[PDB]
Write an enzyme that holds these catalytic residues in place. Sequence first.
Site, PDB file in Angstrom:
ATOM      1  N   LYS A  20       0.797  -1.207   0.000  1.00 53.78           N
ATOM      2  CA  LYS A  20       0.000   0.000   0.000  1.00 53.78           C
ATOM      3  C   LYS A  20       0.845   1.281   0.000  1.00 53.78           C
ATOM      4  CE  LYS A  20      -2.777  -1.785   3.151  1.00 53.78           C
ATOM      5  NZ  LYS A  20      -3.861  -1.538   4.117  1.00 53.78           N
ATOM      6  N   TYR A  33     -12.086  -3.254  -2.586  1.00 53.11           N
ATOM      7  CA  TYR A  33     -12.703  -3.304  -1.267  1.00 53.11           C
ATOM      8  C   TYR A  33     -14.235  -3.461  -1.267  1.00 53.11           C
ATOM      9  CZ  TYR A  33      -8.245  -1.745   0.713  1.00 53.11           C
ATOM     10  OH  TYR A  33      -6.938  -1.635   1.113  1.00 53.11           O
ATOM     11  N   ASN A  93      -1.149  -0.351   7.722  1.00 54.64           N
ATOM     12  CA  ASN A  93      -0.568  -1.642   7.881  1.00 54.64           C
ATOM     13  C   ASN A  93       0.196  -2.205   6.708  1.00 54.64           C
ATOM     14  OD1 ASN A  93      -2.816  -2.452   6.530  1.00 54.64           O
ATOM     15  ND2 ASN A  93      -3.556  -3.802   8.149  1.00 54.64           N
ATOM     16  N   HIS A 144      -1.319  -5.545   1.558  1.00 58.97           N
ATOM     17  CA  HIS A 144      -2.568  -6.274   1.409  1.00 58.97           C
ATOM     18  C   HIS A 144      -2.208  -7.625   0.781  1.00 58.97           C
ATOM     19  CE1 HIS A 144      -6.458  -7.669  -0.080  1.00 58.97           C
ATOM     20  NE2 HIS A 144      -5.744  -8.032  -1.137  1.00 58.97           N
ATOM     21  N   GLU A 167      -9.043 -10.646  -7.207  1.00 59.45           N
ATOM     22  CA  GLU A 167      -8.106  -9.522  -7.129  1.00 59.45           C
ATOM     23  C   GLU A 167      -7.088  -9.538  -8.242  1.00 59.45           C
ATOM     24  OE1 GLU A 167      -6.766  -9.836  -3.197  1.00 59.45           O
ATOM     25  OE2 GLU A 167      -8.756  -9.395  -2.374  1.00 59.45           O
TER      26      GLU A 167
END
Lengths: 150, 150, 150, 150, 150, 150
Positions: free
Chosen positions: C11, C51, C114, C117, C128
């Site tokens: 990310k 998402y 974080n 992904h 994905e």
Amino acid sequence: VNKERTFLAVKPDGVARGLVGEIIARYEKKGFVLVGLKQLVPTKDLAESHYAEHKERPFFGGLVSFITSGPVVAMVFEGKGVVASARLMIGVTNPLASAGGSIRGDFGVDVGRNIIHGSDSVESANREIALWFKPEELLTEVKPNPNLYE
Amino acid sequence: VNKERTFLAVKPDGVARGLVGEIIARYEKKGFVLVGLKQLVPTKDLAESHYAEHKERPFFGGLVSFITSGPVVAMVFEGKGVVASARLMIGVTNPLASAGGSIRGDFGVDVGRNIIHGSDSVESANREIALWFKPEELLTEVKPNPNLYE
Amino acid sequence: VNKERTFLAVKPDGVARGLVGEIIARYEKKGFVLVGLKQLVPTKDLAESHYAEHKERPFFGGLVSFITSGPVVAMVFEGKGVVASARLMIGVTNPLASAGGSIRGDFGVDVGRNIIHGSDSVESANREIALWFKPEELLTEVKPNPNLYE
Amino acid sequence: VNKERTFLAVKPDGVARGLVGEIIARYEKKGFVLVGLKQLVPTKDLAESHYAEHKERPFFGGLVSFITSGPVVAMVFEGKGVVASARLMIGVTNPLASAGGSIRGDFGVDVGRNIIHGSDSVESANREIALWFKPEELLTEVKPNPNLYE
Amino acid sequence: VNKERTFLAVKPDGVARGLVGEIIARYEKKGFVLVGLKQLVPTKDLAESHYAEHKERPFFGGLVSFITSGPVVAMVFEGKGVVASARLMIGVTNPLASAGGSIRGDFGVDVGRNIIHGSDSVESANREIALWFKPEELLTEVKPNPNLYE
Amino acid sequence: VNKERTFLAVKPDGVARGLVGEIIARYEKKGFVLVGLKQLVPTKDLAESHYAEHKERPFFGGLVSFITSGPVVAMVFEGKGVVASARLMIGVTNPLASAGGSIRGDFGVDVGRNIIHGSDSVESANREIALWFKPEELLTEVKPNPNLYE
């Protein structure tokens, strides 16, 4: 809150084994901010105060003697959940039971020479920080990498 | 002689980029002994004194401002030929010209943000050490790994 | 089967913190094969689609905004049990609860930042991958180190 | 100027030996910014164009065949003096003559399998970048760590 | 030729300082193939034979005593130009003059405790190998990573 | 007791993947002392004896064939709780289930190519050591870093 602080001290065995930079680098990578840092040879009084909680136990004497046996690198780190997080990065009391990936899991073999100390709670962190550092020795304005906190 | 000492200071950019532990670990691996260590935000007076040699140059102002712009990790290392050795481990003034394997070669790109300062001679090392550290802050008895010196 | 694939995306915070190579190296060391790789700044449409499962939740907006806030390094890895294995290498949702040795355990402090992904299942991995990559962008013939599989 | 760009391609041998992340991490640590990145198996036309300068030499054929023999990770890095700096981080043509600390010095043994390609000049960098990447694939707004540039 | 071999011995100081794995890993990364390997405490006869070239010098005695003072990890590596390459990876005689990136540059400080020995020529390599290893202890069929040699 | 010993063997896949030094370095860092070390291509007899416990199982044949398929680096480490500790550093049987931070967690993907063998108990350690090493090949006097044991 992100202004939580913990006290860490690389004990004499860690300093003597050249692990100071390796330990600091692990916390810096995690994103915790170095707020206090200094090397010192602890006096008996500071030691007894540090381990006061065990003052009634027999191993208290051995704790005091060891930590005053050589230089110690004391440091204070700041960040969200740093107190529990740092404990987790350290490993469990017995280095042999600590998992690879943790400081004690990677570098230690004996309980008595377990390399580093980390506050076990926010309150002990606050007591230890105030014990080992003068307020002038702690950063007041802490700015972390902006990519760390939402 | 093995009791030679040098002064190193991880400047604000190095501290901010999380390179403190990586830099200390490199010197510990080499076999040099940490004799002094502390984080501080340098005052203007200490800064001007540190860079006194350039006080007549125009970039002197920029040097002073930067080093007082944030925390600095000052340290003193001891060992044989540590002053020249540490310079060599650091790299040349321009990080772009520093070879991979050196601190500036591996992590820097700009002269003005070249991460660390290392004394350039034994005499400047002695002046800087006495400038940045109280004698009480320096180890008196240094014991290196016995496998380091003949 | 050894042709299992998973989708990973470093990310914006991971890219910005210079962790791209460190993350890729961990998977390469494990023995997983890089089958797709590219840096991109995700558009809102790709983000909302990525998402979609949270589209009814309130934090959905924050997820979409963050991932489109800067470059992202999307990659597809292939190998036996790569989907669960990669999740394990990543750590748990909260970086503070992730163990040292994992990506989030070693480098993160906040749920919202974080770092990476990883698909949570083979089916989400398939969705994905097809979402983030054109088929032309994925290796068709994958050959792993022969010392990896029996 | 800090907006200088260079083209790097981890050749098939580097990809196959799992060095992609290790190479990217070295540049990220240095402070260069990843501006383009993608894995691809080069076609003969792209290869011949890439090595056009040697089209009259006999080893031209071998260059073209090798680079099209497997996946390649092409990337574009941005930063001050990145073109010369990246060459320096790479090492010399012969990996055996490259110093430890450089990519070829650390990981290679043969000229023909020298792991990575780096533009040799700003103009070749500009030609290669435009050759290997569509403009849409390159970051337009690059923001480096603020602690890197004065 | 790619079947060139060199003899390396991590001396007692290197073994005692825990650098055995770090040294072997550097050669494995380079692409050289481990052809012989064993730990032993050298006898006086093997030592005097190893350093025979200095038998007329006064420091010959000190060389013999040190190498027989503790365990030694002897190894033979194979690869193209391994003899000169390994010397280069080792550094120069004086660790203080060795550049970061080399074994002695990174870990040593004293000539007398310079960590490792590497043959200085193909002929000395051949003599040392035959001196330290029985033929049964050396791999006959060496297969390197195919991505290493053209 | 600190004189506990364990037998470790980097299997053919680990040797072939260049992980020998990385594995040894992990144990040296932990503080365990290398007491025996040698590379060898195991004969069928040694292999069948090593895996005797599975001699009645069908996969016994596959175990024997693999371990004799190429060089193996056998080693004996000494230290307190080394047998359980080393198992812990290794990971579980299935590399995919092994946590990052462990050898199999970091580098393996397949049960059949799980890189290293570690004795599972003190008694099996004693049997394996006596199986793979002549007594002359094991250090008799072991001296660990004094900062390791209390």
